[PDB]
């Protein structure tokens, strides 16, 4: 059967955690140029509250989209540095996610 | 001899532009 929009949006959110997916998406000009994609990104922000957050599979993308949120006022430029910066800042970002959830 | 060697100008931060497309079977 045809999946509902819940399933596709949740799978998109969980796939946003992949660094390769983010690099590919930012590689194309019209994806960042079009305001539709960033409008959808800001629309996706409302999943950080329960009970929606209970349905997530990988919490890392929760910050990544938020990090992607920062990308709208930080610039495309910085795309090259994305894998290095995520690899370097994985420890502290995981720690802050744990502080947000595990405590 | 050699007046001066070249400074290492590596750019690992370069993201590269390899096209990926034939992944689906």
């Amino acid at each position: 059967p045809l999946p509902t929009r819940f399933e596709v949006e949740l799978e998109f959110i969980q796939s946003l955690a992949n660094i390769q997916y983010v690099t590919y998406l930012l590689t194309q000009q019209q994806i960042w140029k079009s305001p539709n994609f960033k409008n959808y990104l800001k629309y996706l922000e409302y999943w950080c509250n329960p009970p929606y957050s209970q349905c997530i599979v990988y919490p890392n993308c929760l910050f990544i989209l938020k990090l992607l949120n920062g990308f709208m006022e930080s610039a495309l430029e910085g795309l090259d540095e994305l894998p290095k910066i995520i690899q370097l800042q994985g420890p502290q970002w995981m720690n802050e996610m744990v502080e947000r959830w595990a405590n | 001899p050699s007046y001066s060697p070249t400074s290492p100008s590596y750019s690992p931060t370069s993201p590269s532009y390899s096209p990926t497309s034939p992944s689906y079977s």
Partner: protein, 169 residues
């Protein structure tokens, strides 16, 4: 391609759609007093939770003060004893008539499998909560007690100094 295309509705919502969303939802609520897609602005309306409270994905289904266990213990002990006994009987089978040894092997595994079932009801998150509870509780008690110890020793030193200066008067 390797990367699936973005969702289609993503491209429908511009800044104008975002700013006209309030009047659109007001009109929709006034009119209202699977959702059919009659207008391009319908998706921004929050999707409704399914009544069955279930979600299917990849062939799998998904959906208070912490915010006879002796029967299970004795069942586990007797199951372990029976498992050892059946292991002995199976190795004896291997000794004398190994040709039919498998006839018991899977049987023993079933008991082992039952052991896994016996773990399922015993599943431990509350126990982890308890252990974290006592570790931070004892850590904060240690910090507190060293605080009053150090302030009390400072006060004792101050009193001793006061006595010393009074004696020198």
């Amino acid at each position: 391609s390797l990367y699936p295309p973005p969702p289609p509705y993503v491209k429908f919502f511009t800044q104008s759609n975002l700013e006209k969303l309030p009047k659109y939802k007001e009109k929709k609520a006034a009119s209202a007093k699977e959702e059919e897609i009659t207008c391009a602005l319908d998706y921004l309306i929050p999707p409704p939770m399914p009544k069955n409270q279930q979600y299917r994905a990849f062939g799998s289904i998904w959906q208070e003060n912490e915010s006879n266990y002796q029967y299970k213990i004795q069942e586990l002990r007797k199951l372990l004893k029976s498992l050892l006994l059946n292991y002995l009987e199976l190795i004896g089978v291997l000794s004398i008539n190994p040709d039919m040894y498998e006839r018991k092997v899977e049987n023993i595994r079933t008991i082992l499998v039952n052991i896994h079932h016996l773990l399922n009801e015993y599943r431990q998150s509350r126990e982890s909560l308890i252990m974290l509870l006592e570790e931070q509780l004892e850590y904060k008690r240690g910090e507190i007690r060293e605080i009053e110890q150090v302030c009390k020793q400072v006060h004792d030193k101050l009193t001793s100094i006061q006595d010393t200066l009074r004696t020198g008067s």
